[PDB]
Amino acid sequence: RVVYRPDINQGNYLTANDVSKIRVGMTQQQVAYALGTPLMSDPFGTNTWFYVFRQQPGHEGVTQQTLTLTFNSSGVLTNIDNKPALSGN
Amino acid sequence: NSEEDVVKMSPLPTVENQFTPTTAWSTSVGSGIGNFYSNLHPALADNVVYAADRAGLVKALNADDGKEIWSVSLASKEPALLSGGVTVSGGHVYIGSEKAQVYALNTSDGTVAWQTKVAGEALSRPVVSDGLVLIHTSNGQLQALNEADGAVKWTVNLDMPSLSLRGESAPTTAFGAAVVGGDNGRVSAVLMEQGQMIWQQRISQATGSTEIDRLSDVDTTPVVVNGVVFALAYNGNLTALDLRSGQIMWKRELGSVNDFIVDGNRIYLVDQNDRVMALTIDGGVTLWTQSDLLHRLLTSPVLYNGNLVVGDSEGYLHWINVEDGRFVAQQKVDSSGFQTEPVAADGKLLIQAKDGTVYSITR
Amino acid sequence: VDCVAAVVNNGVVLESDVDGLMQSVKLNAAQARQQLPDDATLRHQIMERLIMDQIILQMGQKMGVKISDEQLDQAIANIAKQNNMTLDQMRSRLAYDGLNYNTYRNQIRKEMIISEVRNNEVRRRITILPQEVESLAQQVQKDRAYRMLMNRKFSEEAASWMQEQRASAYVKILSNXXXXXXXXXXXXXXXXXXXXXXXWIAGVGYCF
Amino acid sequence: RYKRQVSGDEAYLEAAPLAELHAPAGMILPVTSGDYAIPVTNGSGAVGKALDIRPPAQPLALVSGARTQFTGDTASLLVETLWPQVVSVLQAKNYTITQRDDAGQTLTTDWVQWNRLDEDEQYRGRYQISVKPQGYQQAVTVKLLNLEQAGKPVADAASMQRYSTEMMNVISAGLDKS
Amino acid sequence: EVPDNPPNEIYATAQQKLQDGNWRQAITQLEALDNRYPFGPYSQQVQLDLIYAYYKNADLPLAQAAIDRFIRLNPTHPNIDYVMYMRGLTNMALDDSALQGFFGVDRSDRDPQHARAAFSDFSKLVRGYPNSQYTTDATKRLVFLKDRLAKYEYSVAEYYTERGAWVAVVNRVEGMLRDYPDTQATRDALPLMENAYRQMQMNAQAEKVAKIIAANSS
Amino acid sequence: FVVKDIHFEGLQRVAVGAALLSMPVRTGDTVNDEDISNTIRALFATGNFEDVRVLRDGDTLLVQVKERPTIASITFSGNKSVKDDMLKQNLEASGVRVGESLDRTTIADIEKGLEDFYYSVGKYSASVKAVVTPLPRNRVDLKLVFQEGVSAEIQQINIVGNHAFTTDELISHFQLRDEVPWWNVVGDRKYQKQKLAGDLETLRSYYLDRGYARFNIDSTQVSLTPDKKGIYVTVNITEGDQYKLSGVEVSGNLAGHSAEIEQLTKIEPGELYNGTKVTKMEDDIKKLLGRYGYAYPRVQSMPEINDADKTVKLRVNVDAGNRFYVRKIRFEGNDTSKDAVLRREMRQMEGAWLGSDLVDQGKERLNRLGFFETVDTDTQRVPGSPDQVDVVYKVKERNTGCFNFGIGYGTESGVSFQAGVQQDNWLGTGYAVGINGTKNDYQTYAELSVTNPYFTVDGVSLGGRLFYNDFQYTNKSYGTDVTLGFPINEYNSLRAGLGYVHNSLSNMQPQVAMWRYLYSMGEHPSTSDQDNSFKTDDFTFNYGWTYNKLDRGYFPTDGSRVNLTGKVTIPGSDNEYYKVTLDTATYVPIDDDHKWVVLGRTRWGYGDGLGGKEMPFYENFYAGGSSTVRGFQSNTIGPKAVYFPHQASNYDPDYDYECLCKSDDAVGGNAMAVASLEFITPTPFISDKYANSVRTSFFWDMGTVWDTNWDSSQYSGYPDYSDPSNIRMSAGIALQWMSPLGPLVFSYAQPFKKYDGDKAEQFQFNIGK
């Protein structure tokens, strides 16, 4: 509206250049080097890494992009899920 | 303001006037040495003397009358900063400068025979011998200039601790070898035909730590007689050592001198505390001392009629009897002060004041 | 029973050493030579020697130079050869003379380490121009006079360095050269947030 | 009392007890990396205002080389006619001697009163003084039999410690007065 | 300032001044006695009395300096637990320095470093000498300090919840869950983590904390 | 033989068994052989002794021990150029302090250090002597004798070796002085060692930024006369030759921001080589990279130089590195203000990529609040993961307000009671609260105001106020107002609100202005005699706009602040008017360290009526006093009240009530304009320990105010009040200090240009902002 709202950033921003080099079959060190340390990790049971990239210019659309990596209990990568988000709101 | 607490004890000289020496003339060369420490001093050659100032002008004088002969200015843009003591030889007069320029003038004609650029300020008096004039610049560099026209021959390199005293030492010539001082307490000898060393002997005895204030650089011209040479570091250790090699014939701790003379089987010098003193060249035995003058900022002692002539910053010229010391006379020659070394030759002496310029003194 | 004669920086020299080098080394079959000054006169120089040996010891310890036991045994062999007195019977000589095995080992370790420190420290600052060798040869050639020249430079520079170090070393003499043994020697009210009480003119001025 | 008192209030005694949250079925909570761990300890200790903050008394200085020694209820002291001196200082303080064996060098005094600028606590004491030699020297022992507060016997260790140390200090200062 | 005197009577009058409670005067005599005889027979008593006087006189920094000095140069002493407990008490008192105590303001989300230091001192005391008489009060103070730190973390998480920074909220709640598991502030703050997951469209992770809070709703 | 036991003598720093743990003799056990000498050596190796003397008078070790003394006090005489604080700090850093053991080695250590320091300062004829005086109980008192002789004077700076610039021009820029001007006393000719390195780098920079690249300093010599009075400095330079930029190449692991980097490196062909230019290029590249996240880049430049064509190629190698994310933000020092009041002024959200500009922007915003003395930021890397960082803000709290409660006057003259609280930070909650009530026989006043700057978490502020005036002629007035404000952008704020007031005054003095206002309002009573009353009520809407950009909040040293406030009546009230006021304070720094500042202050004000009704006289503008042209009076500048001839009127006592005659009394017009310029200098009597709290200024002030209602008839023979061309002027000196009781301002101002009825004063004291 009229009241000023500062820009809000809530996670590491990931670019398609570094996304395209991720293929199922690497270990923790390789993906950590390629993309960066994940801010959000599942603290319950299984080890899951969440790369969330969300912006908010203030009274516009809240752009979001989530990338969930599911690792097995051995240190190697198993599952990838890249969601451009924007599921409605 | 509150830090002017100097430990300064220079008693006024005891009033003991016996004889009556006087002056001959003054010349007023102009604003000369002034407060700036330097080595400018008049030189006498065949009834003609010469003088100069920090500004750059050089004057020639006839003896016995003090009449001008020819005056030139070696300025153009700014002072030439004349530093090298005026020396004369043959048909040339040589002068140094702080701008790394050495001037050689053609005496009677008063024309610039040449000038050349050296490495660093040329404080030391240019010494002439064997068709070469030697400059001991303020970098440890010792440069030989060809007598014909400039044309540096060899540049010997010497060390330079970074707190040295000003007034680097001019070398002396003996049997084809130049004996020179140094800024680190080491007396060197050099073969003055290609620039090769013979022996480099250290004579200083410095401590450490607080020694950052102790400098012990030899800025005195070494004197040579027979097979021995003599040297004096700033902080002590008078040395008499062999000409052939750096073999110390005999040393003494006292040292601490900036000017000395040797003659008549004895050595007459002044300590860094202005304590004029006499020694025996045989082994370094003290004949006598004269401790009336302390912290008075004396000058070089010169022989004249068997008397040691000295000066001070207050201007009073003192005569010392060569026999155990006694104030023969005190002359209120000038109020400017005496800082440069007096010259004595041909039975006649000259002293250039800091600003009063050359003064001719009679006995 | 023992005392300390002087203290130097960190270490200390005690009466044991001065007694050992004075009672056991003075004309008492310690090179004899039938020449020895007064005990009081030589006491000063022997104390100087002991304290300077100590000073050299800490100076070396600053660099921490270590010498191993094989060098000590080779030094013992050198002593045996230079005494024309073989190592086992030389050891017996030392044992009954007063210096037993451990004292001799420590003494040789100390003398070797101080000699090594002296040599390195002096030779690091020595200079010889390749010019005067020919001059001395002509006065007298192919390194014959070079050894003598280096020896003279060593003699001057070592003494100068000794004076320089002795002058500037912290020593306190508690009291209470050297010929040595000659042989067997190798090489309004207010309160305090803020509160002001003054003096109708009574007004509180407390500041949070 | 104003002194002998914790400066803060008592509001820290109403903290909610810590209850470990339980894990759900078939899922593990984040590990207890919480170095902020509280070891479990019994009670029987004064809390809040009931606790006293008082510099633990130590037997003071006397004749040189006299090593003091702590005990839970007693106090000891090495020294360098020591028993006659001790008897002398006790008489100087006018403490009545109920029992005395000079041969055994052991004595028992009367009730001694200790009041220290606080009301209802004019401490009274039953003390059994004794001396016996130890090694090359002699050792003085002050043994506190009983302690009373306003006529009420009490048994807290700190009070017995302090009021044995005070009596030991009385001897020690009296011993220096010789 | 006090006239030179042999130590016994000056110590006696310092003790009397402490007895009366005139701490400001007593510090002078105690400090003079400590200065004039640095290594006397009973300098330890002087140090302990000085610590007590400094703490009572609300002169905390000097008390802390003396406590650290005594710990350093007397590592072993029969009553070092008293000094440790007093150091912890000094830190905890230093935490509360404001007029807000008059109004009962919730001094929980202010600067907590003093609370952390007090927790460290009390935990060191409890782990060190669990047979002393200061242990129960130390345990109560430790519980209070842990709750206070948990409350501060919950306050930060609540502010970020209000702002709209969901990832910071998740990180803070995870930190509380990892470091303050058994406190009450973590139970209060778990719904904030659930709301963050719900707002950030990660439901599969949201129902997990929903189950955690539902099973432990009580 | 066998020793039975041990005995010692000294027990100060070493206990009975403390020494036993170290000595290898291990008595009470096996022991024998000269090894006792080794025991002595082991005991002394500890360093806790000064002398040891073993003795075997019996069969027990009689070890005489003389322990090293513990220093009793430190004292010193003769120190003039060196302050006691530096000496005691060095001693604390030298391992010597009261109560600590004394070791003789540290005596020589500190002697050497002090002598070297004096030799660096220039006092070459200086010597420090350390005297130790023994005292009973093995302790010492340390005396230091300083024989500070005389400072050496520098004589000349010689730049021998130059052939392209004047030597005087080269040495003009130097911090060291060759010849101090005669008309300059603040400067002198002392030789400080660091200044030599500084001006060597200055000369090097001078040649590097004028196309000279093949440049170096051959040598530097510091000669000293054999008097310790003359210091000569000589430097040898290699002039080299000028050069031209062949071109610039930027290569390396540049991030996706290559385009703007290339634009930044665009250099005009034919320019001269400047080292400052390339340093600025590197700093700009680093800042541009740090804005986008890469906080730790690596930028280097090798100027590959070809002398054949005198062309230099700038080869810039840039390695971006890894982007850094903030793990958490912590706050230290806020013992009173809570965490939210700090965290809400941030612009760097937690759990986001580090914007190195946002951290400093948040630091500035926190510094602008006005209740934090010093704010320090620190972006420190985590000890664990590579690309993580913790941002720490350290703030030092500042006292904000005061609580006052004082009864004054009295003594048969009247009780003068007053009380109040004035806080900008109420208990750290962030609220702004203010209550003030004064009670005296002559008049009674009360007011209250509460403002929340963050009613919602966007910047919205809500505030309200109540006020009450009633006293004697009689005057009563009370009212209420409520406003709210919101931010337009980073800097601007916009406010709107409404409120109502009620006034009632009676038995008013007769004077032209108030009668004019009444006739405008529609009441025309008698003029010579006054026994009338009047009542009014006003409902008004007010608005405002503030632009703020300041370095700090309490006497800032940068930026500017403009503040506009305008109130207009709503239809339905008794009066109809509109007022517009403007304020503008601007600061410009001239010194690099922001120590010398030029201040420009201005204030403007207009006010008038609506629909033919005059502006009420109880809200006119005023001037004088403090906060305006200072040195005249409180609210006296401008139009002066002129009274109609007096009559029966009110009760007129004899010897009292001595009131169209002209009077010096003032009433205030409805158009005001004042301005002022100030120069700020540091206090020349203190140091930096207090320099952040005291401000000294020289000021010039001008001010004027006039009445927009003019009569050709009534004002026929009276001064032209409606004429603005006449102004009042003043000048003087002002001193401000953040006293522990709030901000206090002192001023002395000689009245420069004043008019009739001003009663201008000289000394002026005030409390407030």
Numbering used by the authors:
A (entry chain E): 25 to 113
B (entry chain B): 24 to 98, 105 to 392
C (entry chain F): 25 to 164, 393 to 428, 431 to 441, 443 to 447, 449 to 455, 595 to 603
D (entry chain C): 30 to 109, 115 to 212
E (entry chain D): 26 to 243
F (entry chain A): 24 to 495, 504 to 690, 699 to 808
The authors write:
The outer membrane is a formidable barrier that protects Gram-negative bacteria against environmental threats. Its integrity requires the correct folding and insertion of outer membrane proteins (OMPs) by the membrane-embedded β-barrel assembly machinery (BAM). BamA is composed of a 16-stranded β-barrel, which, in E. coli, is preceded N-terminally by five polypeptide transport associated (POTRA) domains that extend into the periplasm. Unfolded OMPs are delivered to BAM by the periplasmic chaperone SurA, but how SurA and BAM work together to ensure successful OMP delivery and folding remains unclear. The results suggest that SurA binds BAM at its soluble POTRA-1 domain, which may trigger conformational changes in both BAM and SurA that enable transfer of the unfolded OMP to the BAM lateral gate for insertion into the outer membrane.
